[PDB]
Short mmCIF file of C-alpha atoms and ligand atoms in Angstrom, two decimals:
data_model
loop_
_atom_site.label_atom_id
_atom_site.label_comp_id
_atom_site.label_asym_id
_atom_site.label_seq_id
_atom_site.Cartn_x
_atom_site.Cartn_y
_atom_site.Cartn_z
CA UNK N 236 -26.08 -129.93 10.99
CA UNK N 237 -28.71 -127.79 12.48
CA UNK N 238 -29.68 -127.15 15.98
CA UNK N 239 -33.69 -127.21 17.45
CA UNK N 240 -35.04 -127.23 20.33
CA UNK N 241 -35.82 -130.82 20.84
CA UNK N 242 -37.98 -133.34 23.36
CA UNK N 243 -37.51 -137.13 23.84
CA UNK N 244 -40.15 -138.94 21.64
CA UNK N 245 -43.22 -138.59 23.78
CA UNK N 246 -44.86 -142.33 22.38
CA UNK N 247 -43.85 -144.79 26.18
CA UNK N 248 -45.38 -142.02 27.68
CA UNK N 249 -48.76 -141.62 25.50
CA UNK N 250 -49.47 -144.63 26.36
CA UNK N 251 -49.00 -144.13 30.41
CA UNK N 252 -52.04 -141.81 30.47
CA UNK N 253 -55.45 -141.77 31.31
CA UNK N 254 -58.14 -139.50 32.54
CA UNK N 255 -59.14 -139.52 36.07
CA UNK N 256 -62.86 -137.85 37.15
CA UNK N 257 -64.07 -137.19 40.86
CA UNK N 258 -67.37 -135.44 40.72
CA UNK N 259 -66.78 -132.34 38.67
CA UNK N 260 -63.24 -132.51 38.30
CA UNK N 261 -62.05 -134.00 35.73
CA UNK N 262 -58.05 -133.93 34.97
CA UNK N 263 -55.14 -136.32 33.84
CA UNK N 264 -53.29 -139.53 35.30
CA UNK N 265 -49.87 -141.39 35.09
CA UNK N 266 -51.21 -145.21 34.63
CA UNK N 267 -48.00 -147.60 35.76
CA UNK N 268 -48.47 -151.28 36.34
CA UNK N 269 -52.06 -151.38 38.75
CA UNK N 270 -51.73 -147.70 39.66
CA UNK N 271 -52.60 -144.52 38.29
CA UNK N 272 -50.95 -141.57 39.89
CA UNK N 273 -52.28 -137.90 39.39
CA UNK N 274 -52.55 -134.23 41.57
CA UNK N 275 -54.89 -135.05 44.88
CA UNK N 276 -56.44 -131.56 43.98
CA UNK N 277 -58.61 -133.46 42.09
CA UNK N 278 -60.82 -134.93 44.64
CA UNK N 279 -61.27 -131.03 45.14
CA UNK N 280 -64.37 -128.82 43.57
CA UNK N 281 -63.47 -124.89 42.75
CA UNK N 282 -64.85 -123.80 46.12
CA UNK N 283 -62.10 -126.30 48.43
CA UNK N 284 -58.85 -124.96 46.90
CA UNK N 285 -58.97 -121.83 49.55
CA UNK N 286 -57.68 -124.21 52.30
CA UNK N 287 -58.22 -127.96 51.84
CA UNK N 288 -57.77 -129.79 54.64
CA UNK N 289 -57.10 -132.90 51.98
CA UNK N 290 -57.39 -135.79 54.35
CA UNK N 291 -61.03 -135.25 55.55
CA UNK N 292 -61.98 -134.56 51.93
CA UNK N 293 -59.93 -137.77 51.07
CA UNK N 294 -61.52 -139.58 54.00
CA UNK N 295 -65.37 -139.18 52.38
CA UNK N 296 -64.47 -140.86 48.77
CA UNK N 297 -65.74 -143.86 47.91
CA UNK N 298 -63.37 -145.72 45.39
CA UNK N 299 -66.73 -145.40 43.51
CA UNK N 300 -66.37 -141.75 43.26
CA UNK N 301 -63.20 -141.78 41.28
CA UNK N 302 -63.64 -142.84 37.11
CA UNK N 303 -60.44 -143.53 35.54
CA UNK N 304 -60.20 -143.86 31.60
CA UNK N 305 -58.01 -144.95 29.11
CA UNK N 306 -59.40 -144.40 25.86
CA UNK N 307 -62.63 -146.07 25.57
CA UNK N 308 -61.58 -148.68 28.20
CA UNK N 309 -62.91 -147.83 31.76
CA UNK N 310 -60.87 -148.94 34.81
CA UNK N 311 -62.00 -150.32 38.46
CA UNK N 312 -60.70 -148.49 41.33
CA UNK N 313 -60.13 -150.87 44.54
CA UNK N 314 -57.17 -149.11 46.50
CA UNK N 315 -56.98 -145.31 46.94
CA UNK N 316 -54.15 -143.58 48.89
CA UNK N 317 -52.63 -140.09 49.36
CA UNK N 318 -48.44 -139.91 49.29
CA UNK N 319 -48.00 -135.59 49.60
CA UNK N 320 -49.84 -133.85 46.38
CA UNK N 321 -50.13 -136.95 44.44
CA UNK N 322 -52.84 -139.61 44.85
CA UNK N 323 -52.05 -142.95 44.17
CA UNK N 324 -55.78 -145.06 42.53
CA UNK N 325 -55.53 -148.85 42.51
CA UNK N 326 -57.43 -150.63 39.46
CA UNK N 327 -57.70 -154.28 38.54
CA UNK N 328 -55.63 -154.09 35.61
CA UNK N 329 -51.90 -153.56 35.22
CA UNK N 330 -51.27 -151.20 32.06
CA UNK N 331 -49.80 -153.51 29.38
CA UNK N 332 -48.17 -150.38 27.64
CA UNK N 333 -46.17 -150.05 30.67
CA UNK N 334 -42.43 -149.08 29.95
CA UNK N 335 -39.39 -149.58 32.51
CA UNK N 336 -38.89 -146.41 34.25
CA UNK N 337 -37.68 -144.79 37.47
CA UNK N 338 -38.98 -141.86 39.69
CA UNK N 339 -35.97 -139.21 39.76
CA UNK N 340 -35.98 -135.68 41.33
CA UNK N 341 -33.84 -133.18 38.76
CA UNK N 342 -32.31 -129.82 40.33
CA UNK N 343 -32.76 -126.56 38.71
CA UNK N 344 -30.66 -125.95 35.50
CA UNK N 345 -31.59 -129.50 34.57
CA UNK N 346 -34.38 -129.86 31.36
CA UNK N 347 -37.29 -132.19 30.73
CA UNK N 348 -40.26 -133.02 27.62
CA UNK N 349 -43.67 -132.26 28.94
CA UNK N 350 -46.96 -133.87 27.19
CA UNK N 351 -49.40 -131.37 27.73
CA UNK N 352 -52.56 -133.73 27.89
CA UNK N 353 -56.43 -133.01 28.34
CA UNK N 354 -58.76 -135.64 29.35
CA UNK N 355 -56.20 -137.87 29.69
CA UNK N 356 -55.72 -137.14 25.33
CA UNK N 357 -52.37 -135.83 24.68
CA UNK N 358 -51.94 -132.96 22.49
CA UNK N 359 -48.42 -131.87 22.51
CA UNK N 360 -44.73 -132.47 23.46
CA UNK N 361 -41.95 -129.35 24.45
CA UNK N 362 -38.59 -129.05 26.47
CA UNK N 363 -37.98 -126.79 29.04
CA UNK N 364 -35.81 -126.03 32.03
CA UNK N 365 -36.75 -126.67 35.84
CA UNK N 366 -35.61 -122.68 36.36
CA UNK N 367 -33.61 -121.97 39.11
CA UNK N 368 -36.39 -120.44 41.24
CA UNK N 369 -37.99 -123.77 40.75
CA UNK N 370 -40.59 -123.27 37.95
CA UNK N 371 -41.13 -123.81 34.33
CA UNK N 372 -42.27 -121.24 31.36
CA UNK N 373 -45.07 -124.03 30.06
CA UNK N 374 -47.87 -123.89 28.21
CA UNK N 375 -50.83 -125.25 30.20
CA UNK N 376 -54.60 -124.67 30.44
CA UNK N 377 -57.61 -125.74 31.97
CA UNK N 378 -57.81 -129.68 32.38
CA UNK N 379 -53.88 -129.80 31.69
CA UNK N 380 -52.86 -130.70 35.43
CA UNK N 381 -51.62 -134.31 35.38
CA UNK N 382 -49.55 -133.63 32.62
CA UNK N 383 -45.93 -135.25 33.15
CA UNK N 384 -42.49 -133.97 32.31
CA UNK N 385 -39.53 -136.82 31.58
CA UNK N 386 -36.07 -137.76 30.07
CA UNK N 387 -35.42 -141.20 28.41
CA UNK N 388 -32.37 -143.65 29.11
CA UNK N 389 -32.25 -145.53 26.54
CA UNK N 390 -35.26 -147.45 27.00
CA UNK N 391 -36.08 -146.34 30.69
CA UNK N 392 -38.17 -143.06 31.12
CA UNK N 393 -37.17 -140.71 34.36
CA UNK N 394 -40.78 -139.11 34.74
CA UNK N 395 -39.38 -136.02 37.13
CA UNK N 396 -42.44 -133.84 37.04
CA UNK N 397 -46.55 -133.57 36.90
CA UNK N 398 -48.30 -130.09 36.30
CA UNK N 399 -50.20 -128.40 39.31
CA UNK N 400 -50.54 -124.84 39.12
CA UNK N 401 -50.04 -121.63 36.85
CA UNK N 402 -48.42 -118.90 39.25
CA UNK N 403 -49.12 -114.61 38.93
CA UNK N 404 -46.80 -114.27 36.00
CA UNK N 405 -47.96 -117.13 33.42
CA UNK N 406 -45.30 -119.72 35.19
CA UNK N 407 -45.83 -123.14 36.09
CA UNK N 408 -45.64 -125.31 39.18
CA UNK N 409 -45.70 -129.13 39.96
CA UNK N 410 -44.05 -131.99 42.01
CA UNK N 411 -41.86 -134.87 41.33
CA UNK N 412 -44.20 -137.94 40.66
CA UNK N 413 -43.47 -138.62 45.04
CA UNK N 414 -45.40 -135.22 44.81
CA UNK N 415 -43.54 -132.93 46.82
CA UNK N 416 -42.85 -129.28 45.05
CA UNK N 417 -39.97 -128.01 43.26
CA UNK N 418 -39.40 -124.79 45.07
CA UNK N 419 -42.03 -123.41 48.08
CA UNK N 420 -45.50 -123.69 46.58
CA UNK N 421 -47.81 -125.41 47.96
CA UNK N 422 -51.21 -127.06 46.37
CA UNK N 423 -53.84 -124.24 47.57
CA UNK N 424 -55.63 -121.00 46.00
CA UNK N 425 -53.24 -118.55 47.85
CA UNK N 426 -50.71 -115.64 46.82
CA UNK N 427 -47.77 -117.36 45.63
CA UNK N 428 -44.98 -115.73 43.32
CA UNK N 429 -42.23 -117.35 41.94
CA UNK N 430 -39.29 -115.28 43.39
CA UNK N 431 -36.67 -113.64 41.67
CA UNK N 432 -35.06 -115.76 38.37
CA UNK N 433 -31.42 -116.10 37.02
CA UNK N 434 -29.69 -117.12 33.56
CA UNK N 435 -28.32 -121.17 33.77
CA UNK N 436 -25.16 -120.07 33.18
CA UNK N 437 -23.51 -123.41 32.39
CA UNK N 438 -26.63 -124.26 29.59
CA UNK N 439 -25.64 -120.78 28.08
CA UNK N 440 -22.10 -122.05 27.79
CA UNK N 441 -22.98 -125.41 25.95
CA UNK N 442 -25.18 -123.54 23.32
CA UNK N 443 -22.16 -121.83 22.90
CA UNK N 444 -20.37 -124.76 22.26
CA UNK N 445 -23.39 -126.36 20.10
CA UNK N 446 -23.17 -123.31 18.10
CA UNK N 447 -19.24 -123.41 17.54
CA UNK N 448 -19.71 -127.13 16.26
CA UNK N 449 -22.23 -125.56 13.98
CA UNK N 450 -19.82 -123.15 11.83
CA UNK N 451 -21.37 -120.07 14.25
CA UNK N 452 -18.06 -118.59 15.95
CA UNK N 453 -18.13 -114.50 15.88
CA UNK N 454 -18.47 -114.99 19.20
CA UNK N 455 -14.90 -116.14 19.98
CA UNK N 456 -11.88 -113.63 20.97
CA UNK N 457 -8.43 -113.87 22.05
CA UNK N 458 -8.38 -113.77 25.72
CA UNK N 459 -9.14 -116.07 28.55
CA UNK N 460 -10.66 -115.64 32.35
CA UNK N 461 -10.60 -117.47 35.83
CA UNK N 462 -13.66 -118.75 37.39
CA UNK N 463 -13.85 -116.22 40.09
CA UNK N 464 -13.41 -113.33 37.81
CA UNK N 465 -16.26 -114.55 35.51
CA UNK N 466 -18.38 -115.08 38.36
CA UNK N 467 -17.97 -111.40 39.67
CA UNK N 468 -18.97 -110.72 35.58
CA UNK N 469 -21.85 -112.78 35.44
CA UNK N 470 -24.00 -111.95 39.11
CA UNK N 471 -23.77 -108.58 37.72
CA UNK N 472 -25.91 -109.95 34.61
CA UNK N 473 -28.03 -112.20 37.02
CA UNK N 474 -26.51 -115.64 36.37
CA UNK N 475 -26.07 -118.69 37.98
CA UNK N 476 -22.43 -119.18 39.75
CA UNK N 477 -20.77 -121.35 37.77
CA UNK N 478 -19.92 -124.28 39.74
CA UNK N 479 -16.59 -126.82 39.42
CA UNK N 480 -19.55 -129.67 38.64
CA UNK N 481 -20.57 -127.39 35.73
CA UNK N 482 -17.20 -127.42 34.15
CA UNK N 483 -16.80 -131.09 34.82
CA UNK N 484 -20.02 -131.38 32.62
CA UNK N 485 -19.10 -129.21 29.89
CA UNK N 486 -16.51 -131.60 29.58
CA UNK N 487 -17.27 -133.25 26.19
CA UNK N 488 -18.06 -130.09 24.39
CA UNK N 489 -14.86 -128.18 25.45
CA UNK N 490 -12.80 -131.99 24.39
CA UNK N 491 -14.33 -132.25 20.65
CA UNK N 492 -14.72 -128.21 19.83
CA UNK N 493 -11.05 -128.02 20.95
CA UNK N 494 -11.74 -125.16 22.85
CA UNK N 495 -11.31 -124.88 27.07
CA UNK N 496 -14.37 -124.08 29.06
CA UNK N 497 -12.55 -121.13 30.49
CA UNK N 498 -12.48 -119.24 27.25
CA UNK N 499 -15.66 -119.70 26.04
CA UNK N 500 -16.06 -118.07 29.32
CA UNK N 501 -14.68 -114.60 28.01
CA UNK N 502 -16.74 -115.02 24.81
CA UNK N 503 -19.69 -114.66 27.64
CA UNK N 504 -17.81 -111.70 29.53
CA UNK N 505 -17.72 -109.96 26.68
CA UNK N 506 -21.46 -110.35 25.13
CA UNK N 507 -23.04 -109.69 28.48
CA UNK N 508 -21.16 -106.20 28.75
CA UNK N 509 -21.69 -105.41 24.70
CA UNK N 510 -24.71 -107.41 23.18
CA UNK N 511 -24.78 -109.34 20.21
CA UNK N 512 -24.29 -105.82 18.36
CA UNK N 513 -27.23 -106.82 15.85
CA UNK N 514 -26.03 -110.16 15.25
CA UNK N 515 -27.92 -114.03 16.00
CA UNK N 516 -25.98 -117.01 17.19
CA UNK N 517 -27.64 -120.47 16.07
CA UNK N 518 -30.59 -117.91 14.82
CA UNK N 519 -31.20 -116.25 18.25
CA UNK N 520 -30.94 -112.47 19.00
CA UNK N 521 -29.89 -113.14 23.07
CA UNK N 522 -28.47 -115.92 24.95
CA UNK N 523 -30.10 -118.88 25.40
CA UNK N 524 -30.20 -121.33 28.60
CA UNK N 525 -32.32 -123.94 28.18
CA UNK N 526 -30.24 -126.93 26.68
CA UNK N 527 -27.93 -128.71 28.89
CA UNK N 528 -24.62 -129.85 28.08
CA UNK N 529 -26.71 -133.61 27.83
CA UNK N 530 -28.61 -131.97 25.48
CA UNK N 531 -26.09 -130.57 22.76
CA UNK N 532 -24.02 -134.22 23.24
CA UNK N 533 -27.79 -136.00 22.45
CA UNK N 534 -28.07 -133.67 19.72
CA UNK N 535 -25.33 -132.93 17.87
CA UNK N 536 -23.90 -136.44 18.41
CA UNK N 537 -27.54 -138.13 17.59
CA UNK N 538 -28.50 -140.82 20.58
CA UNK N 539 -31.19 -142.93 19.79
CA UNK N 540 -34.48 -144.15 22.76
C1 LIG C 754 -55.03 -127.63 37.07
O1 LIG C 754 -55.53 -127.90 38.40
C2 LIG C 754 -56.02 -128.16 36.10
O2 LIG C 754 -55.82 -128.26 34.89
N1 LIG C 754 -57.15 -128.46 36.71
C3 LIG C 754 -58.30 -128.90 35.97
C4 LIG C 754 -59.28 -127.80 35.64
C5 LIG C 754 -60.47 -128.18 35.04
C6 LIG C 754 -61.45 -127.26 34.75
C7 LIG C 754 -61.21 -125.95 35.07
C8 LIG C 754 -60.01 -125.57 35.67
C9 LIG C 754 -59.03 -126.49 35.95
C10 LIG C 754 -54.83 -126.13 36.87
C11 LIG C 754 -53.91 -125.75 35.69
C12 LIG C 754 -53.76 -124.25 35.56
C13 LIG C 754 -55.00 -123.49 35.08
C14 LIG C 754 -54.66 -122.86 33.73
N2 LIG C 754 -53.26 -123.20 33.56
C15 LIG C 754 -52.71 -123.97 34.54
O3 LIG C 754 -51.54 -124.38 34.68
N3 LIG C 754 -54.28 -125.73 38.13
C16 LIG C 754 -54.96 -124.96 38.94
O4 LIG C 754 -56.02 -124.51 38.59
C17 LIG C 754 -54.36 -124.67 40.30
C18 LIG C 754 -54.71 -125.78 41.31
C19 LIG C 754 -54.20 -125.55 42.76
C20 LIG C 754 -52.74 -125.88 43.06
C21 LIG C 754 -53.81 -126.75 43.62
N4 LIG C 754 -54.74 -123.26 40.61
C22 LIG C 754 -55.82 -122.96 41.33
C23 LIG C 754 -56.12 -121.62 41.61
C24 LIG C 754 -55.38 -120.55 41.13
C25 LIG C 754 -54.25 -120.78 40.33
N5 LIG C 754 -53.42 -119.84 39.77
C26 LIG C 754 -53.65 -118.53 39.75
O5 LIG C 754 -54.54 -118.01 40.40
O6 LIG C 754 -52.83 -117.70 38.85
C27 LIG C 754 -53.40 -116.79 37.87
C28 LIG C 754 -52.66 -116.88 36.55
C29 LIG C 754 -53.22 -115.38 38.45
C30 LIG C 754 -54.88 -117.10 37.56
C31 LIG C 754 -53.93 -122.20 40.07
O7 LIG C 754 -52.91 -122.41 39.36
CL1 LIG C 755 -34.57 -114.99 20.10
#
């Protein structure tokens, strides 16, 4: 019983980084088998981030110019390379910590654990949600780009972000670790805003569902809804459309809580259009959207990494 928000143990991934200097800039790295990948921006100074034209920057470093550093262990670079906003440094040695993992690209709606590291030291570990205009409500400052964000299979960590940028509002930017953008941004000082946000609508339901199997069921009513008459309810609230694949996935929670998707759905119909009416569910005062259905099974189930 119980119900936190919760990341993956952040330990295979403590030891994966490192801290990368070039000149004056010093941020963090990813260190897998011989390679370290971090943000390119790094080669950059605070003057070149107005427009970069990375390649000719890129062109005049020596391998000598970059320092990598894990712990008190420093690292030769041999082999540099640029794949879009990530640089890819060659050293001599292979990382021993090393874990199995694979590159993956989530969606929006889909959450992650980010290590917010500094010097390539890691201070701290938090979930959140790739939002559906394609950032992240972090917590980030100076020195924290090269951060990653990850889920665990098992044994096998999905690294599916590194930190970039902090946009007008106090949101958060990166790549996946090929280091192409979620959403338009791009890796330059310009104005940038995040664009308009909405509720995940389908996380929503399975806190609902977490908070059912947790004795917390004011909530429920005696009605039902159709899809298409919810989602006429719900755009009028600013949430997601709530997709056939998103009822699929609630699967498992609607099974074991013995109740169908499609009347939880009413339950949401009904606190949109009247509030909680001073009332918390699982201890919050409003609705929250930033577990997945993945997340409540992990959690209230009790997988092990
Ligand atoms: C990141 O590059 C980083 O940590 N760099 C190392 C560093 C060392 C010493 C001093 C500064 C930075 C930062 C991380 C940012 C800063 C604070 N919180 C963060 O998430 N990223 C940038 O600085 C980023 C790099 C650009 C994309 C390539 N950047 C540069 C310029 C401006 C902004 N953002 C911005 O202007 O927004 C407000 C909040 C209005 C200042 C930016 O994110
Ligand atoms: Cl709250």
């Amino acid at each position: 019983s119980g119900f936190r928000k919760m990341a993956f143990p952040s330990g295979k991934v403590e030891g994966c980084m490192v801290q990368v200097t070039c000149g004056t800039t010093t941020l963090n790295g990813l260190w897998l088998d011989d390679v370290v990948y971090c943000p390119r921006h790094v080669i950059c100074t605070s003057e070149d981030m107005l427009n970069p034209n990375y390649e000719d920057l890129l062109i005049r470093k020596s391998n000598h110019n970059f320092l990598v550093q894990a712990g008190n262990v420093q690292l030769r670079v041999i082999g540099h390379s640029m794949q879009n906003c990530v640089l890819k440094l060659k050293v001599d040695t292979a990382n021993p910590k090393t874990p199995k993992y694979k590159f993956v690209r989530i969606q929006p709606g889909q959450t992650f654990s980010v290590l917010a590291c500094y010097n390539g030291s890691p201070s701290g570990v938090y979930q959140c949600a790739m939002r559906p205009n394609f950032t992240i409500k972090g917590s980030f400052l100076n020195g924290s780009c090269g951060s990653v964000g990850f889920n665990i299979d098992y044994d096998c960590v999905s690294f599916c972000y590194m930190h970039h940028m902090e946009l007008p509002t106090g949101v958060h930017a990166g790549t996946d670790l090929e280091g192409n953008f979620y959403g338009p941004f791009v890796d330059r000082q310009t104005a940038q805003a995040a664009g308009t946000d909405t509720t995940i609508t389908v996380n929503v339901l399975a806190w609902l569902y977490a908070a059912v199997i947790n004795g917390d069921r004011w909530f429920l009513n005696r009605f039902t809804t159709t899809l298409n008459d919810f989602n006429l309810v719900a755009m009028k609230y600013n949430y997601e459309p709530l997709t056939q694949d998103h009822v699929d996935i609630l699967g498992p929670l609607s099974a074991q809580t013995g109740i169908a998707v499609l009347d939880m759905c009413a339950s949401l119909k009904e606190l949109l259009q009247n509030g909680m009416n001073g009332r918390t569910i699982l201890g919050s005062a409003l609705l929250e959207d930033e577990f997945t259905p993945f997340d409540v099974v992990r959690q209230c189930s009790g997988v092990t990494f």
